[PDB]
């Protein structure tokens, strides 16, 4: 049985997501334009990423119990989560027809060769596409989508966390909501091992994040916020 507090936590996260993700993609007009030379797509995706960092921050703030953390713990959690939660969010625009991210128009349909033109090797792109395909194949309810983003953000084992017990306590509450959700609301055969498969997607994102942490004249073409978050 899903408790009242649990459905409230879902209701919150759905709304929080609605406010931080605009599926019209109308703000994309404001970015430096996409040019399709080396790194011709870098400015445009760096802006997208920057804009997306902001949205993730808006979303995080609405996670129940996140405001109860110190501003330091909030800051480190978002520093580490940003890129993961972006790859997550992006599943919404991602389509398996093309294996591309389709954001309403040709100019904003981003394929492997676009990501490449932002200066990225197949070493990152490939784990990244396998991830989007795997996640799409899960076929999450929008409820499970937002819980997974929340859970991803509020992880006690991220570098720089002071009060892990509190981070952990906030997270536990979300996972329990998700686990109880799946039982009560996800029917079979989709429900099969869907929690352990989701937690796996969380491990694939940590890797992607760490591989990205490894991968000056390019640092200029990024944004202030992006440089602040990725160092």
């Amino acid at each position: 049985k899903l408790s009242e507090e649990q459905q409230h936590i879902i209701a919150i996260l759905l709304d929080a997501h609605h406010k931080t993700y605009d599926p019209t993609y109308a703000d994309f007009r404001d970015f430096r334009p996409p040019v399709r030379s080396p790194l011709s797509m870098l400015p445009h995706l760096a802006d997208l990423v920057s804009y997306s960092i902001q949205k993730v921050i808006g979303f995080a703030k609405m996670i129940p119990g996140f405001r109860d953390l110190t501003s330091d713990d909030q800051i480190v959690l978002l520093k580490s989560s940003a890129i993961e939660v972006i790859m997550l969010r992006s599943n919404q625009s991602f389509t398996m027809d093309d294996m591309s991210w389709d954001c309403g128009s040709q100019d904003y349909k981003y394929d492997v060769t676009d990501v490449s033109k932002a200066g990225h090797t197949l070493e990152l792109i490939e784990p990244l596409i396998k991830f989007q395909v795997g996640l799409k194949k899960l076929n999450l309810h929008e409820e499970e989508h937002v819980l997974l983003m929340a859970i991803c953000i509020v992880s006690p084992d991220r570098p720089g966390v002071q009060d892990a017990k509190l981070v952990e306590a906030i997270q536990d509450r979300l996972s329990n909501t998700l686990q109880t959700y799946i039982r009560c609301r996800h029917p079979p055969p989709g429900s099969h091992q869907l929690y352990a498969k989701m937690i796996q997607k969380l491990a694939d994102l940590r890797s992607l994040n760490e591989e990205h942490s490894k991968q000056p004249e390019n640092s200029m073409k990024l944004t202030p916020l992006v440089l602040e978050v990725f160092g």
């Binding site: 902001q54 921050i57 808006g58 501003s71 909030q74 800051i75 978002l78 520093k79 202030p224 602040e228």
Partner: peptide
């Protein structure tokens, strides 16, 4: 170290 991050939070 993180003024823009802390601004978007507060």
């Amino acid at each position: 170290n993180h003024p823009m991050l802390m601004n978007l939070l507060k």
